[PDB]
């Protein structure tokens, strides 16, 4: 198209507090850009992936209900030959 850009990464799943029992829990990562992406980074704050997640693609699908363990930042940066662009949520844990 006649504009390029870096891929816009979004986080999309459960929109607002995360509840300890429910599976809707998961999250989906989203870059968008002229071109798809050439390369495609998923990483968190902790630098590791958590045991109750099941990570597919781009696409964070969680194992079941959210743990205290599934909290914290799920990121993903998206390459493209226009720029790396990163995207990032913050789950907390319903007390």
Same mark, same amino acid.
């Given at each position: 198209?006649?504009?390029?850009?870096?891929?816009?990464?979004?986080?999309?799943?459960?929109?607002?507090?995360?509840?300890?029992?429910?599976?809707?829990?998961?999250?989906?990562?989203?870059?968008?850009?002229?071109?798809?992406? *050439?390369?495609?980074?998923?990483? !968190?704050?902790?630098?590791?992936?958590?045991? /109750?997640?099941?990570?597919? %693609?781009? +696409?964070?699908?969680?194992?079941?209900?959210?743990?205290?363990?599934?909290?914290? *930042?799920?990121?993903?940066?998206? !390459?493209?030959?226009?720029?790396?662009?990163? /995207?990032?949520?913050?789950? %907390?844990? +319903?007390?």
């Amino acid at each position: 198209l006649n504009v390029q850009y870096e891929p816009e990464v979004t986080i999309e799943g459960f929109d607002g507090n995360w509840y300890l029992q429910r599976t809707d829990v998961k999250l989906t990562c989203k870059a968008d850009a002229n071109p798809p992406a *050439t390369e495609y980074h998923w990483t !968190t704050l902790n630098g590791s992936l958590p045991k /109750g997640v099941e990570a597919q %693609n781009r +696409t964070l699908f969680f194992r079941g209900p959210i743990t205290y363990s599934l909290a914290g *930042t799920y990121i993903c940066e998206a !390459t493209n030959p226009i720029g790396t662009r990163s /995207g990032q949520v913050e789950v %907390n844990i +319903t007390h």
